[PDB]
Design a protein around this ligand. Structure first.
Ligand SMILES: O=C(Nc1ccc2n[nH]c(-c3ccncc3)c2c1)[C@@H]1CCN(CC(=O)N2CCN(c3ccc(-c4ncccn4)cc3)CC2)C1
Ligand SMILES: [Mg+2]
Length: 355
């Protein structure tokens, strides 16, 4: 029971885990906690274990932990990281501190894949899977808004899973950890409203980085971010500027003007396989897809369904993946809850125990 746990030091943290999980080794860490690889001696396979330390300690951590528990439980899709187990070593609501989330173990992070040249077959398949995951979230009313390579993982067989569920409908932390903002859409950067295709901008940024092996828009803050976007893509049209509130419009209209670059110049043939006629045609199609994702004005940007149907992508199309029954989310206030620390503590404990 309590004797069915053991503890090991993992860097500056203590992991206290069920004895079924053996041979822990750190594989990543972030604002939310440390993740280890482990061998599950019962399943006879390796797994990933994330430790959430006092996730109820503030509202930002708490909302994310609670929503991720609920979503991981109700979602079952091959391109979304799946839940294998959840436990706490503490034996009561009173003593509760930590949550451990056990997931499928993948082979690499997409940041490592970005450092490799990819053939069109692998590149298109990875993008196809991203799009299936995103569409599946959208089908349940979940718009991610913060898709990024660090939170996407892959196997050697080119299978891909998204690790997180995004920004909900909402962030200050005392932390040395820094939020990666490079993939966020113009309507996020400028504080505009958004719709489902906010996520397609991020897919564009990821695709473009897979192709050129550089972060497209590495801004140090949102002002820098916007400059980098307009330097490459060009100052947006007046029809876009008109959609901005005056405080933001005066700012956007008063930046120096940029012509931008064609997509042929941003993503030349030398960045793609382009020897054979097959590869030439695929390079053309890839560039066309990029040109439809990396569109500042969201009203003119590709949708998930148009991307799934695009010639570069549609060779993979399978409605069991792309038209799967939507997740059924049981907490109808999932994105709107406001709670005290003590309230979030009880809500999370109950999720963990199933209570
Ligand atoms: O890692 C996290 N969560 C999970 C969860 C379940 C998992 N299942 N399987 C894996 C897995 C990951 C990596 N390798 C094998 C398996 C999981 C990871 C958390 C989520 C947030 N986080 C990732 C993160 O933000 N990172 C920063 C970027 N980083 C990174 C950056 C550059 C390179 C790199 N590699 C080669 C060349 C150049 N750069 C590699 C990793 C990866 C960790 C920690
Ligand atoms: Mg991360």
């Amino acid at each position: 029971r309590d004797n069915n746990f053991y503890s090991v030091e993992i860097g500056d943290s203590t992991f206290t885990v069920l004895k079924r999980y053996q041979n822990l080794k750190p594989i990543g860490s972030g604002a939310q906690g440390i993740v280890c690889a482990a061998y599950d001696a019962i399943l006879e396979r390796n797994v990933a274990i994330k430790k959430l330390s006092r996730p109820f300690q503030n509202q930002t951590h708490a909302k994310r932990a609670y929503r991720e528990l609920v979503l991981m439980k109700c979602v079952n899709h091959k391109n979304i990281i799946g839940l294998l187990n959840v436990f706490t070593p503490q034996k009561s609501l009173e003593e509760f501190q930590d949550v451990y989330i056990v997931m499928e173990l993948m082979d690499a992070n997409l940041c490592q894949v970005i450092q490799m040249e990819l053939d069109h077959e692998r590149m298109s398949y990875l993008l196809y899977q991203m799009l299936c995951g995103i569409k599946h979230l959208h089908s349940a009313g979940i718009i991610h808004r913060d898709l990024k390579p660090s939170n996407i993982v892959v196997k050697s067989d080119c299978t891909l899973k998204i690790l997180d569920f995004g920004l909900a409908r909402t962030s200050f932390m005392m932390t040395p950890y820094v939020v990666t903002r490079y993939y966020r859409a113009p309507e996020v950067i400028l504080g505009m409203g958004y719709k489902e295709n906010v996520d397609l901008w991020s897919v564009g940024c990821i695709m473009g980085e897979m192709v050129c092996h550089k972060i497209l828009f590495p801004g140090r803050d949102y002002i820098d971010q916007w400059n980098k976007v307009i330097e490459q893509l060009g100052t947006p049209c007046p029809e876009f500027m008109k959609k901005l509130q005056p405080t933001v419009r005066t700012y956007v209209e008063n930046r120096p003007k940029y012509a931008g670059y064609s997509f042929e110049k941003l993503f030349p043939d030398v960045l793609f396989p382009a020897d054979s006629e097959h590869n030439k045609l695929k390079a053309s199609q890839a560039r066309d897809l990029l040109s439809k994702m990396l569109v500042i004005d969201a009203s003119k940007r590709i949708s998930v369904d148009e991307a799934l149907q695009h010639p570069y992508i549609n060779v993979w199309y399978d409605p069991s993946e792309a038209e799967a029954p939507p997740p059924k989310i049981p907490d109808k206030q999932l994105d709107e809850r406001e709670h005290t620390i003590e309230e979030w503590k009880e809500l999370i404990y109950k999720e963990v125990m199933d209570l």
